[PDB]
Amino acid sequence: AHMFMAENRLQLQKGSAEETIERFYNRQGIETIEGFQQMFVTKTLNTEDTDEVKILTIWESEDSFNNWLNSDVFKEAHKNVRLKSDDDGQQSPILSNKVFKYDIGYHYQK
Amino acid sequence: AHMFMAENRLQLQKGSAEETIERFYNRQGIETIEGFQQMFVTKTLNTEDTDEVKILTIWESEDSFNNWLNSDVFKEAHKNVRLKSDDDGQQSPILSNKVFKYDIGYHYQK
Ligand code: HEM
Ligand code: HEM
Ligand SMILES: [C-]#N
Ligand SMILES: [C-]#N
Ligand SMILES: [Mg+2]
Ligand SMILES: [Mg+2]
């Protein structure tokens, strides 16, 4: 079976990538889901408009990822997360998210 | 120092993702580059008119990637690569490519 990747792509106010990335430093349970393998948190370089941060999660299968989405740990990690558009979210630099899903056709680790 | 990711995004004619991914199975020298750590080749899951394949390379530093990009082994790996838009690109399903660069702010591997 091929590995699977899920990306959450954060659209952020200009300059807010760093303060946003720091929120991802301490784990909140994703690592306890069977089939979770790796996570990367990236800042897109050379952006001229909004900042862009991507959260890449690598899994044994799409099923594993779905299991995390359906978990209480997913809820607990996101319980205080607000978009700028939320009623109490005016101060958030997070404008929107978009999820992308991928089949990993090849992987190599040195 | 932060890890670094360079991505080559390929826009491909519909149905050609699988045949294109197979071209990346066999290494052509990138593994010999000091600082090279991982590579992923992905197919985006969606309902679009074109296929999309991304090549993600993970490095100890941006310097590492620059060394590879400017290397003889990079040149060799790509010497027979053509785009559909090229004069001799008749058999190529590759419509275009775009490079994206990222600082890796955080990484976790189970
Ligand atoms: C609904 C929109 C979402 C927004 C605005 C958002 C943003 C955030 C933020 C700000 C954090 C850190 C929270 C904190 O300060 O403690 C977080 C946690 C996290 N998010 Fe999201 N997120 C969303 C949904 C998703 C989705 C769909 C994914 C799938 C890739 C994802 C992946 C992650 C991961 C892997 C963590 C860390 C989880 C852990 O350590 O257990 N998020 N998210
Ligand atoms: C100029 C546009 C490019 C196109 C159309 C392209 C497409 C391709 C193709 C089709 C292959 C496999 C060739 C074969 O059949 O042997 C390949 C090799 C490869 N490409 Fe690209 N590529 C381009 C530039 C880049 C860039 C900028 C990167 C940076 C991430 C990259 C990353 C890779 C990697 C890691 C390999 C495998 C190299 C090895 O194993 O040593 N390519 N590319
Ligand atoms: C969460 N991204
Ligand atoms: C090369 N992608
Ligand atoms: Mg900037
Ligand atoms: Mg502007």
Please state the φ and ψ torsions of residue A78, each to the nearest 5 degrees: -105, 5
Residues with Cβ < 8 Å from B82, sequence gap 6 or more?
B88, B89, B91, B92, B94
- The residues, any chain, with a CB within 8 Å of residue B16's CB and separated by 6 or more, are B51, B93
| Overall domain count for chain A | 1
Is there a contact between A78 and A72 (Cβ–Cβ < 8 Å)? Answer: no
Chain A residue whose CA is closest to B56: A107
Strand blocks (E) in chain A? 3-12, 36-44, 51-59, 94-109
Q: Using the atom order of ligand 3, give the atom closest to the CA of residue A81.
A: 1
B37: containing domain: 1-110
* CATH, residue A9: 3.30.70.100
- Which method was it determined by? X-ray
Return the ∠ at Cα A107 (arms to A102 and B2), rounded to 5°.
Answer: 90
Residue B42 in contact with residue A102, Cβ under 8 Å?
Answer: yes
Q: Cβ–Cβ of A109/B38 closer than 8 Å? A: yes
SS3 B60: coil
CA of A16 to the centre of ligand 5 (A): 9
Distance between CA atoms of residues B50 and B81, nearest Å: 19
Name the residue among A15, A69, A71, A62 with its Cα closest to residue A43: A15
Q: Nearest CA to B42 among B12, B64, B69? A: B12
* CB B83, CB B95: distance < 8 Å: yes
Query: Under an 8 A CB cutoff, do B102 and A54 touch?
Result: yes
